[PDB]
Amino acid sequence: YRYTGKLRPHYPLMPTRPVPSYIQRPDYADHPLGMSESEQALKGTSQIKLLSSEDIEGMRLVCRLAREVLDVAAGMIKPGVTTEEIDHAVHLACIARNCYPSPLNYYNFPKSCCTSVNEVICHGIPDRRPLQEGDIVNVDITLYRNGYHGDLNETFFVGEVDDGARKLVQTTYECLMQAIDAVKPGVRYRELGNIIQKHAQANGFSVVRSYCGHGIHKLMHTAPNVPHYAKNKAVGVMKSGHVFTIEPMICEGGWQDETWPDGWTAVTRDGKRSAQFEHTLLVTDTGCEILTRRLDSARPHFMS
Numbered sequence: 001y002r003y004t005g006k007l008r009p010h011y012p013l014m015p016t017r018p019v020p021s022y023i024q025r026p027d028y029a030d031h032p033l034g035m036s037e038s039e040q041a042l043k044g045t046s047q048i049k050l051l052s053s054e055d056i057e058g059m060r061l062v063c064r065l066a067r068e069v070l071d072v073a074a075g076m077i078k079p080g081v082t083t084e085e086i087d088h089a090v091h092l093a094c095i096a097r098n099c100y101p102s103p104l105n106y107y108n109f110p111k112s113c114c115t116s117v118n119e120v121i122c123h124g125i126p127d128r129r130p131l132q133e134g135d136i137v138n139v140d141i142t143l144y145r146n147g148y149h150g151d152l153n154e155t156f157f158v159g160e161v162d163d164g165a166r167k168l169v170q171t172t173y174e175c176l177m178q179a180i181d182a183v184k185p186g187v188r189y190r191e192l193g194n195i196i197q198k199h200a201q202a203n204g205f206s207v208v209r210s211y212c213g214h215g216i217h218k219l220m221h222t223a224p225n226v227p228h229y230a231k232n233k234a235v236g237v238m239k240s241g242h243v244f245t246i247e248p249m250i251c252e253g254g255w256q257d258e259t260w261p262d263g264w265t266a267v268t269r270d271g272k273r274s275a276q277f278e279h280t281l282l283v284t285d286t287g288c289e290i291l292t293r294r295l296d297s298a299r300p301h302f303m304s
């Protein structure tokens with residue numbers, strides 16, 4: 001394998017971390033290949049669940065807990081901390097909230113969060129690498145509570161960063177929020193990529209094509225599929241009671257991606273930086289509820 005940039009994996013990984021049995025587990029947790037029967041059973045379906053009031057309560061709670069765990073991770077970001085140390089903290093913070101760390105064993109993913117540095121687009125695996133001053137690092141948190149998943153992510157700066165890092169991360173955050181601002185009943189899911197791409201392209205960045213936002217509730221990934229680039233062909237129209245994420249990945253160079261031999265880590269083919277932000281959203285009768293928002297503080301971590 002020819003690496004696309006300066007990043008490398010830092011092995012060995014710690015043996016996988018157990019979750020106590022009193023924590024309720026998603027189906028794939030105990031499947032030998034980490035397959036989710038319940039997702040596979042809706043593979044190829046375009047139909048979007050209309051959440052009940054009970055379902056909405058469940059999503060509100062797990063998403064608030066997921067935000068709390070993200071905040072824990074944001075607190076740890078400093079030069080010299082390893083990504084594995086972040087993941088260990090995350091793992092304990094999930095268990096403390098009586099939640100299962102959704103990524104753990106999802107299709108045999110080895111860790112309890114995703115940590116994506118610099119040219120990593122998404123799904124980086126926490127490992128023994130200490131964060132370096134000038135890195136950008138995204139932490140993606142997904143929790144499972146009482147049969148509901150909640151999903152969010154933010155990009156952080158490690159110490160002082162360059163102006164290019166600042167612009168990339170600001171633009172990516174703006175892309176997400178412009179999309180969110182458009183969410184309401186009657187909007188086609190395909191429009192959001194037109195919005196994102198327009199803002200990315202205006203700032204000289206490209207938009208990853210291979211990974212999309214997604215429905216989420218009882219399943220971690222389900223309908224709708226939500227592309228982040230323009231002129232996509234996504235199926236569906238927003239209605240009150242839909243829950244889904246929007247999670248644009250924006251790049252300094254070209255949009256093309258490839259995957260490391262680990263089967264997870266997605267990197268820019270050119271080795272240039274990429275940043276991401278993610279929220280889980282509920283469509284209401286007039287607009288949307290950002291389930292993973294901060295309740296206590298006006299701005300994402302990288303501004304603060």
Ligand SMILES: N[C@@H](CC1CCCCC1)P(=O)(O)O
Pocket residue numbers: 102103104106109114122123140141142151152153214221247278
């Ligand atoms: N939270 C992320 C999913 C995660 C699935 C579990 C295994 C690692 C990637 P994503 O839906 O890409 O935001």
Ligand SMILES: [Co+2]
Pocket residue numbers: 140141142151152153278
């Ligand atoms: Co995520």
Ligand SMILES: [Co+2]
Pocket residue numbers: 151213214245247278
């Ligand atoms: Co997601």
Ligand SMILES: [K+]
Pocket residue numbers: 116117118119120121122136138273274275
């Ligand atoms: K990145």
